[PDB]
Design a binder for this molecule. Structure first.
Ligand code: AGS
Ligand code: MG
Ligand code: ZN
Ligand code: ZN
Lengths: 105, 396, 121, 111, 124
């Protein structure tokens, strides 16, 4: 099978995490000003220049990350070779391969 | 004469007068497919009858005010003839700001409040400052406190001295109710049924069924079982808005293991999502956020501070915000902090009766004080000295 | 007894060893006699391991790794142990019966000893 | 109860320590991130791609039961929780606890 | 060449003789054979009876400030808590008592023979 490089895995993780901050998943039912990144780039905020928004971000946790199954959520001993997603059983692996492995359906 | 207290949160606006009670009103506009040309503003969401597929127009992105038009409309509705009938020229306003608010947003706040409404005086503070003031009023013997504000868009942990905020030790965790609700939607959509357009219903589901587990892996093992022994599993009937107005959980005696019901109710079965979703607050890395959780961040913020003050901070942990209403939140925070705190230092975690309205009560208390007039910035002083002195007096 | 959160020998040779032990009831910082550092190094004690130290003898037993670190690797040959529940410092007053033969046989042969003759014994 | 990992080795990577191990059954395939002790155990007992091995997770006890391309590759789940029952005689307990490496006396007399 | 015999036993069997420290007494107070080749008659008979620590000396040294630095060679309270400090001084007292009791226990036994006797009696 195919294998996804680190850039693809990081892009998928970043895209999934950013989607959790979306206001709505659908479009405007009416169908017919800045953003956070514009505010940050306008603030010209530099690290170590006293307490600010960037320096207030929480650091990495000491306790290691705990793996959970990407399909059912229960703990997952197994890691998918192709995309690096975690899974816990043959049924869950089949569901992951059919749904979100490689092409993101 | 009168004083208006406003907590301009990204999800709920705690607006009220100093001499009256507190009201919780959503601080965002709404659009629905049941209305062709109609945008609901603030508490008008009560008028709609089919909140399924509701569209949210928010004035806050990632917890900071970024959309000014919708915020202006919401404020005009709240200050209009229908809600509060605010006499701007003879009213003082206490309005809260996000932590580390950007300079541009502060300038826009000052300009709008002092020119578009022309308030008599404005006091812009942080919700944590009001919570700390209320806590110190309740406990006069305490010299320090640490405030956990687990809100809609983030969770800050800010330590407060008697009359000063420790800006060095502020730690933000980028997990809030918005993230938890979106994650629950994504889980339910991937596992059982597509609910990504049901933000309102999924939010109610999270508020009704989710809880914080004292033993995570014991609960996972219990949820993995099948039959009577699976006490965690419950059946939730989503509201169809035809005969079931609001969602509810089926009683355990009425639960059917097979999952098929003769009545055509759309039943959503949740077993491990009950505590997996709240766990993101304590373990952000569960979903993929490489950030320390609430207890570790509390300990880190305290331990950055000098040694003499640490035991006082450990004795006055205060939980504020909506996310603090999860069952088991207080006990879990206490257990984890106790595990991490030195044995010689006593740990006390306090969860108020209404963590939503804590900041509003603090604002009312600070309004009633005889030092209130010195804190505010007047419009007459705004004309000449205002734009600098607004930054100078307010400790944002 | 507890999970090791810090293991720092203080140089003058080593004047003392500062150790940090964690339990469910808190964290304690201990100053150890420098002779215990050899025992800690022999037992292969690192941060995250659950150990106990005898106050009177300096004996160290590393009874596995803490189960909070069980997910740090997907496959390690480690024994993961729960974090101890009580206090780090545990005191117990005990009454134990021994016979004179036990004391006789304890002194018949030497115990330990890093010499070659002792090891071969 | 013990956790037993039985499968066919696909790829083993060790770098100067960190390592990865890829194991497959006839129904699933997985990549493992290895710890230092399991890396040492796999280095001591030469394990290469194609070998069918079983691992006791808690001990690193690796026993090679053949090669596959001879024993057929295992079918079901790679990681299995097994219940192992031992019936141990009092004499065996006494001999094992009589001295260090005392279990050897169970085979050579010398008790 | 044959593979070895893999003898499998219950994990509980390997802990049969193990006793938790809180459940067993210190057997080093009866260790006579361990003193041979390490402890001398001088230490047991002449030195220790004269230079044993006392609780008073230990407390005086612990409470006294740090000694002045050794001279170089010459070629010739708002945050104060009363309960925390009471706990800390109780801990210090317990630590000093433990140090005293252990120092007395670790030098209580005298060798049967001693290093001097063995050296005198040991021919080349
Ligand atoms: N009973 C409840 N159980 C769980 N979550 C709840 C409950 N009630 C409210 N919430 C959550 O509380 C959050 C809103 O809390 P608030 O702190 O009032 O938000 P906000 O303060 O207006 O926004 P911020 O964070 O201050 S910018 C939402 O994400 C709700 O889902
Ligand atoms: Mg708020
Ligand atoms: Zn699964
Ligand atoms: Zn995959």
């Amino acid at each position: 099978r195919r294998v996804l490089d680190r850039a693809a895995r990081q892009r998928r993780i970043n895209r999934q995490l950013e989607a959790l901050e979306n206001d709505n998943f659908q479009d405007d039912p009416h169908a017919g000003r800045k953003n956070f990144q514009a505010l940050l780039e306008e603030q010209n905020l530099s690290v170590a220049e006293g307490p600010n928004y960037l320096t207030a971000c929480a650091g990495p946790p000491s306790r290691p990350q705990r793996p959970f199954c990407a399909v059912c959520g229960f703990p997952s001993p197994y890691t998918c070779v192709s995309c690096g997603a975690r899974y816990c059983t043959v049924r869950c692996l089949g569901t992951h391969q059919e749904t979100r492995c490689l092409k993101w359906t | 004469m009168t004083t208006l207290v406003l907590d301009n949160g990204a999800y709920n606006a705690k607006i009220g007068y100093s001499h009256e009670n507190v009201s919780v009103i959503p601080n965002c506009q709404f659009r629905s497919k049941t209305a062709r040309l109609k945008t609901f503003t603030a508490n008008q969401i009560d008028e709609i009858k089919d909140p399924s597929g509701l569209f949210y127009i928010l004035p806050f992105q990632k917890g900071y005010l970024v959309n000014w038009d919708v915020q202006r409309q919401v404020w005009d509705y709240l200050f209009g003839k229908e809600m509060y009938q605010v006499d701007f020229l003879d009213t003082n306003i206490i309005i809260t700001e996000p932590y580390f608010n950007f300079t541009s947003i502060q300038e826009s706040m000052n300009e709008i409040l002092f020119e578009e409404y022309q308030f008599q005086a404005v006091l812009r503070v942080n919700a944590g400052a009001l919570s700390a003031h209320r806590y110190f009023r309740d406990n006069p013997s305490e010299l320090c406190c640490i405030i956990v504000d687990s809100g809609y868009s983030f969770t800050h942990i800010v330590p407060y001295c008697r009359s000063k905020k420790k800006k060095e030790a502020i730690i933000r965790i980028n997990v809030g109710g918005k993230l938890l609700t979106n994650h629950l939607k994504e889980i339910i959509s991937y596992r059982q049924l597509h609910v990504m357009d049901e933000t309102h219903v999924i939010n109610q589901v999270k508020e009704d069924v989710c809880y914080v587990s004292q033993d995570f892996y014991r609960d996972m093992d219990i949820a993995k079982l099948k039959g009577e022994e699976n006490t965690v599993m419950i059946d939730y009937v989503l509201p169809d808005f035809s005969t079931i107005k609001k969602g509810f959980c089926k009683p355990r005696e009425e639960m059917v293991l097979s999952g098929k019901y003769k009545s055509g109710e759309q039943i959503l079965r949740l077993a491990n999502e009950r505590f997996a979703v709240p766990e993101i607050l304590f373990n952000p890395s569960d979903i993929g956020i490489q950030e320390m959780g609430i207890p570790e961040a509390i300990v880190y913020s305290i331990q950055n501070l000098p040694e003499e003050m640490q035991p006082h901070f450990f004795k006055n942990i205060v939980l504020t915000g909506g996310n603090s209403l999860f069952p088991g939140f207080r006990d879990r925070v206490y257990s984890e902090v106790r595990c991490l705190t030195p044995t010689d230092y006593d740990v006390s975690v306090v969860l108020p009766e209404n963590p939503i309205t804590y900041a509003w009560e603090g604002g009312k208390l600070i309004s009633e004080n005889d030092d209130f007039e010195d804190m505010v910035v007047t419009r007459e002083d705004y004309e000449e000295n205002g734009h600098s002195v607004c930054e100078e007096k307010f400790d944002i | 007894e507890g999970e090791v959160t810090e293991l720092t020998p203080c140089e003058t040779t080593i004047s003392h060893v500062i150790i940090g032990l964690k339990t469910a009831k808190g964290t304690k910082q201990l100053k150890l006699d420098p002779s215990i550092f050899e025992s800690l190094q022999k037992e292969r004690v690192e941060a995250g391991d659950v150990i106990y130290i005898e106050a009177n003898s300096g004996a160290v037993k590393r009874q596995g790794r803490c189960d909070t670190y069980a997910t740090e690797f997907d496959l390690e040959a480690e024994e993961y142990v729960p974090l101890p529940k009580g206090d780090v410092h545990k005191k117990k007053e005990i009454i134990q019966d021994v016979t004179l033969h036990d004391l006789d046989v304890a002194n018949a042969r030497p115990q330990g000893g890093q010499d070659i003759l002792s090891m071969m014994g | 109860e013990t956790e037993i990992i039985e499968g066919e080795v696909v790829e083993i990577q060790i770098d100067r320590k960190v390592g990865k191990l890829t194991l497959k059954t006839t129904e699933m395939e997985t990549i493992y991130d290895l710890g230092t002790k399991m890396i040492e155990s796999l280095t001591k007992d030469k394990v290469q791609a194609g070998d069918v091995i079983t691992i006791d997770k808690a001990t690193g006890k690796i026993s090679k039961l053949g090669r596959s391309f001879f024993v057929q590759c295992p079918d079901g789940e790679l990681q299995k929780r097994k219940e192992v029952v031992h019936t141990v005689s009092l004499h065996e307990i006494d001999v094992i606890n009589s001295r260090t490496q005392g279990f050897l006396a169970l085979f050579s007399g010398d008790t | 060449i044959t593979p070895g015999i893999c003898f499998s036993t219950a994990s509980l069997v390997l802990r049969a003789t193990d006793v938790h420290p809180l459940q067993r007494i210190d057997m080093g107070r009866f260790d006579l054979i361990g003193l041979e080749g390490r402890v001398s008659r001088y230490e047991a008979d002449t030195f220790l009876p004269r230079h044993r620590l006392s609780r008073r000396v230990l407390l005086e040294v612990a409470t006294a400030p740090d000694p002045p630095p050794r001279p170089k060679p010459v070629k010739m309270s708002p945050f104060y808590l009363d309960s925390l400090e009471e706990k800390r001084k109780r801990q210090r007292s317990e630590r000093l008592e433990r140090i005293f009791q252990l120092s007395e226990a670790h030098g209580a036994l005298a060798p049967v023979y001693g290093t001097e006797v063995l050296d005198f009696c040991t021919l080349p």
